[PDB]
Amino acid sequence: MNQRDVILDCEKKLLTAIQNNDVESLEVLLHDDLLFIIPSGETVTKETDIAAYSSGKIALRAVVPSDYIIRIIHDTVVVSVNIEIKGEYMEHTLDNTFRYLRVWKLFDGNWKVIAGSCTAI
Amino acid sequence: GMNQRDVILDCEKKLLTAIQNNDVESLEVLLHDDLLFIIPSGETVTKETDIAAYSSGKIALRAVVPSDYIIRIIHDTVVVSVNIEIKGEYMEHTLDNTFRYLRVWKLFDGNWKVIAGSCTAIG
Secondary structure, eight states: OOHHHHHHHHHHHHHHHHHTTOHHHHHHHEEEEEEEEOTTSOEEEHHHHHHHHHTTOEEEEEEEEEEEEEEEETTEEEEEEEEEEEEEETTEEEEEEEEEEEEEEEETTEEEEEEEEEEEO | OOOHHHHHTHHHHHHHHHHHTTOHHHHHHHEEEEEEEEOTTSOEEOHHHHHHHHHTTOEEEEEEEEEEEEEEEETTEEEEEEEEEEEEEETTEEEEEEEEEEEEEEEETTEEEEEEEEEEEOO
16 A cells, blocks of 8 residues: 555544544554644644543544645655534534644654644635 | 754744745745645645745735744654734735644754644634
C-alpha cells in the first residue's frame, strides 16, 4: 500500500473511532503532545479531547469525509478535508460541515496525529 | 539577553516580522513549498498563493503582535498555537482583529520551515 493510501486508511480508522467513541483507538492514533484548534479559538490537548469522548456526551451518528487534499513531506503527511458531522456534541446538536486540518507523523512505524484544527463552513 | 524561549520562537518572530513588512524573500525561506494552510472561509491555501498576496501589494499590515503561545516539541517538529493581532489592510478589508493561528514547523533542509497551519477567526 502506498503512502497516500496508508494515510487514507489511518483517516478511516480515526473517523470510525470518533464515530464509535473508541477511546482505546484514539489513545493510539492521537499523539500525547498534539494541539488542536476548535471553532471557538480554544486550544485542546489530547487529555481534554479523550476526556470528552470518555464522558459519553459525544454521540455522533455520521462523520463523512470528502475532497481530501494531501501533502507528503518525508515522515509527515498534511491533510485538508471536508467533514460533515451529525450527532450530539457536548451541549450542541450537530448537523454541520467543517474543514479539518490534520498533521500525521510516523513514530517508529506508527502514524499518529500531532496537530490539527476544525473550521466551521 | 537571549533565553531558550527566544531561541525556540526565533523563526516565529522572523515570520511575523516578514508578514508585517511584506518580506517575500524571508517568506520563501520560512515556508515549505508543500505546506497547506486553512483560512477562515474554509479554503485550503498553498505557499505560492499565500506569498503572491504579499508580493502583489494586496496586504498592508501595520502591526502583527503575538500573545499566549502554546508550544509542543515533537522530535523534529514544533507545533504552535497563538493569538495574533492583525491590523491593517488585507485586500479591500480593513482588519483590527485577533485570530488563533496554528503552525507546524519542521527542521528540514537545515532550517525551520512551516509545513502546515490554520487561521481561526474569533466570531
